[PDB]
């Protein structure tokens, strides 16, 4: 797996839809500022997508505390309507995390809407590793819908 720092020329970075194409020329990305973090199965440089820096497969361990950040699209369905309640969001997060890890503490930041509409929510907090390999697959696959719209990328950090 490859962890990267990618810059996508402002000309390209006009709308959300244009974003995944530039990096394509699946994988996972999260917008930092267009500044972007790129998690890819292959090593990532186009004139439309310059690469500042790029390879990692973590050892990890069981029962280990880690900081985490994740943009996601928590929604219901009766159209994919957003989950606005703080309780629903935190419950949503632990659910989709399954048995990979438990949510010790988390702050759900109801991000500003992006453009059909996409209501993103950034979950920040700390986890402890319950199922180590199941956590990796969750990272390498992403979490939630609108995964190509910057959502779904789970970032992890020690303490």
């Amino acid at each position: 797996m490859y962890l990267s720092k990618v810059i996508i020329a402002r000309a390209w970075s006009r709308d959300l839809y244009q974003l995944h194409q530039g990096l394509w020329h699946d994988f996972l990305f999260h917008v930092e500022k267009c500044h972007v973090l790129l998690q890819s199965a292959q090593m990532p440089s186009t004139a439309v997508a310059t690469v500042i820096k790029t390879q990692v497969e973590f050892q990890l361990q069981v029962g280990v505390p880690l900081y985490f950040r994740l943009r996601a699209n928590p929604i219901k369905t009766i159209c994919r309507v957003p989950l606005i309640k703080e309780a629903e969001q935190i419950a949503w997060l632990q659910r989709k995390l399954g048995n990979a890890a438990r949510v010790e503490d988390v702050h759900p930041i109801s991000e500003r809407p992006q453009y059909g509409k996409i209501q993103t929510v950034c979950f920040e907090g700390v986890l402890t590793i319950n199922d180590a390999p199941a956590l990796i697959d969750l990272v390498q696959q992403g979490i939630g819908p609108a995964k190509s719209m910057g959502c779904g990328l789970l970032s992890l950090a020690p303490l």
């Binding site: 505390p65 900081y67 503490d105 702050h107 930041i109 991000e111 700390v126």
Partner: protein, 318 residues
């Protein structure tokens, strides 16, 4: 001593407490490091809206700027006791805004109101009406006994605790209240970016006993000491959405500087926080020669077995 300083070292989650306009958790820089923060006005509304407050202190204050839906409410609450005319004149003279059948009338700003206090003014507007008292003269008569008005703040204690500001009408001279309680913004004692740990927040508040007595129309120190105890409880328990220290002094004193150098601990913040608090307290009382009546409740300066004992110790002065 006139000042009672409350030092709470509560412990809980550093998340989902107090948000800003960007729906992010409030913070603050202290000692050059980030601390999670809960605003003082957040704490105060959490207290006066809680059940404990309603059970021990009484009814909260009606804080509004919409005087038109307000003029409804006092009509539909003081309907019997006062004439529909007088009930409107009172509000008009009080706020300065000429009352009408408008359904949109706004005061200068959001001010806390007390129904009991307003009911009192009506009685004076009543005696005015009967004895003919051109409002200008009436204002003079009422200026002579502010204390006889502050008594009605026993209904709205949160006002007497946190004050009230007015820039319009008769409330300018008669309604200005300087809050008796000074409360800090709650901040963590440690750097919020080893093992997972909960957050340890330092809370500080103090009460001007003499001011509180004055704001309540000349209440006794015993009555004020009672309210003070309720405050100690709410500040030590309530959480928006461990260790308690109380001391008497002639001048207010915060212990926030105990945590100026942020607390570092690989497995739990409470214990080194308490030590940091104790270390600093010793240095301050020693250096500044403070001898006021102190009392500390902590499971790890008269020590107390429980919070309720400390809560009773305070009620008996020192």
């Amino acid at each position: 001593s006139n000042f009672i300083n409350i030092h709470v070292l509560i412990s809980h989650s550093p998340s989902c407490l107090n948000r800003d306009d960007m729906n992010m958790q409030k913070d603050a820089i202290f000692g050059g490091k980030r601390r999670v923060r809960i605003s003082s006005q957040s704490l105060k509304r959490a207290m006066r809206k809680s059940g404990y407050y309603a059970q021990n202190i009484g009814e909260s204050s009606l804080r509004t700027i919409h005087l038109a839906q307000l003029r409804d409410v006092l009509r539909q609450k003081l309907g019997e006791r006062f004439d529909q005319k007088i009930i409107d004149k009172t509000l008009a003279l009080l706020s300065g805004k000429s009352v009408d059948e408008a359904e949109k009338i706004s005061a200068d700003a959001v001010t806390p109101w007390v129904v009991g206090e307003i009911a009192w003014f009506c009685e004076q507007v009543a005696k005015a009406e009967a004895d003919n008292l051109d409002d200008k003269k009436l204002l003079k008569v009422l200026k002579e006994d502010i204390a006889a008005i502050r008594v009605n703040l026993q209904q709205g204690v949160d006002i007497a605790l946190s004050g009230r500001m007015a820039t319009s009408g008769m409330m300018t001279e008669l309604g200005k209240v300087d809050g008796a309680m000074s409360i800090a913004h709650a901040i963590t004692t440690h750097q919020v970016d080893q093992e997972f740990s909960s957050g340890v927040f330092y809370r500080y508040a103090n009460i001007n006993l003499a001011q509180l007595q004055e704001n309540l129309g000349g209440a006794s120190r015993e009555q004020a000491l009672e309210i003070a105890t309720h405050v100690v409880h709410m500040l030590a328990t309530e959480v928006p959405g461990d260790m308690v220290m109380v001391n008497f002094s002639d001048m207010p004193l915060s212990m926030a500087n105990a945590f100026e150098k942020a607390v570092k601990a690989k497995d739990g913040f409470l214990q080194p926080s308490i030590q940091a608090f104790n270390q600093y307290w010793d240095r301050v009382a020693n250096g500044y020669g403070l001898n006021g009546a102190a009392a500390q409740f902590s499971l790890s300066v008269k020590q107390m077995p429980t919070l309720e004992q400390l809560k009773s110790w305070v009620r008996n002065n020192g």
